Ligand binder design. Structure first.
Ligand SMILES: NC(=O)c1ccc[n+]([C@@H]2CC(COP(=O)(O)OP(=O)(O)OC[C@H]3O[C@@H](n4cnc5c(N)ncnc54)[C@H](O)[C@@H]3O)[C@@H](O)[C@H]2O)c1
Ligand SMILES: [Zn+2]
Lengths: 291, 7
């Protein structure tokens, strides 16, 4: 939970512009669009990084390259790399960051319209963000289905396999015989229907507020390289203010930058602490932290 | 919808 600024430069002033826009439009709400950057301070090992215990266990197992672990044809051929990843990443093995708790503060103040997330942690929900405000664009472990017929399975049947030494005898469907997996969106599958359907309602909400008060969309801790999520920032209305809190300028904010775009080069946890101070909400934050 | 999860 302690943070520091990324460089000698202060970002307090940029962050103060953000707080200034919410003080001027006090019943306006914010849409957040987040990725793996916001969960780095929680100690979630990156499966692409050498140097993690996960990476070396997956290499030992003959995984050809990291993202094969999220590839349906590979999993069908050999489910063990996926099961080993799950055993290490499964919810309940980490705790939410100070950034995750900022979202829950924004909900308590009724200024959260929706969070769109690329992460399959579920730390937004664990932190107490309501179901109706979350869109887990790449799925989670909380549902499971037969890859062959779609039959539904409680998540606990897959869970119970991961506590076994060694892991063998994978979940198989009692109707068709194919593998059952978690509802994690693998590369090459479509996203859940609620992704497109809710962005459709929220795109319409963004346009209608510019003609009345004014809304804010803040993108944090993502490289905007995975589609179709990363088509979102380009689809934000021309007249709706966009903020990027990211170690680097990426995506549509580097390709096609907009006069009102605000870029803040800062660690998501440090961003959270500066925003809460520039908002005046120190007291209700502190209390959420110590529960 | 946007297509399938890709780079
Ligand atoms: N927690 C998770 O569910 C999780 C963990 C590890 C990898 N992933 C992969 C990540 C992913 C989506 O790409 P994505 O979100 O864009 O990941 P990414 O790893 O490609 O990029 C994260 C971005 O955030 C930046 N970053 C890293 N730490 C911080 C920080 N503390 N504060 C601000 N910015 C930071 C960084 O500059 C980078 O562009 C998927 O394909 C996943 O499979 C998800
Ligand atoms: Zn089946």
């Amino acid at each position: 939970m302690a943070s520091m600024s990324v460089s000698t430069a202060s970002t307090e002033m940029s962050v103060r512009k953000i707080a200034a826009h919410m003080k001027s439009n006090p019943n306006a709400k914010v849409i957040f669009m987040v990725g793996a950057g916001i969960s780095t301070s929680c100690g979630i090992p990156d499966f692409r990084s050498p140097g993690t215990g996960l990476y070396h266990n997956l290499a030992r197992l003959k995984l050809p390259y990291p993202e094969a672990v999220f590839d349906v044809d590979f999993f069908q051929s050999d489910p063990l790399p996926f099961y080993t990843l799950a055993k290490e990443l499964y919810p309940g093995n980490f705790r939410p960051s100070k950034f995750h708790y900022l979202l829950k503060l924004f909900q308590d103040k009724d200024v959260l319209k929706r969070v769109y997330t690329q992460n399959f942690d579920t730390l937004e929900r664990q932190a107490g963000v309501k179901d109706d405000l979350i869109i887990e664009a790449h799925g989670s472990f909380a549902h499971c289905h037969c890859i062959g017929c779609g039959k539904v399975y409680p998540p606990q049947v897959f869970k119970s396999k991961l506590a076994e030494h060694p892991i063998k005898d994978f979940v198989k469907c009692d109707v068709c015989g194919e593998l059952v997996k978690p509802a994690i969106v693998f590369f090459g599958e479509d996203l859940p229907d609620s992704f497109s359907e809710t962005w459709l309602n929220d795109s319409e909400w963004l346009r209608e507020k510019i003609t009345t008060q004014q809304p804010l969309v803040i993108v944090v801790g993502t490289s905007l390289a995975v589609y179709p999520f990363a088509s979102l920032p380009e689809e934000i209305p021309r007249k709706v203010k966009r903020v990027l809190c990211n170690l680097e300028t990426v995506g549509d904010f580097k390709a096609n930058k907009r006069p009102t775009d605000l870029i803040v080069h800062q660690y998501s946890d440090e961003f959270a602490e500066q925003l809460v101070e520039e908002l005046g909400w120190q007291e209700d934050f502190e209390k959420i932290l110590t529960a | 919808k946007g297509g399938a999860k890709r780079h």
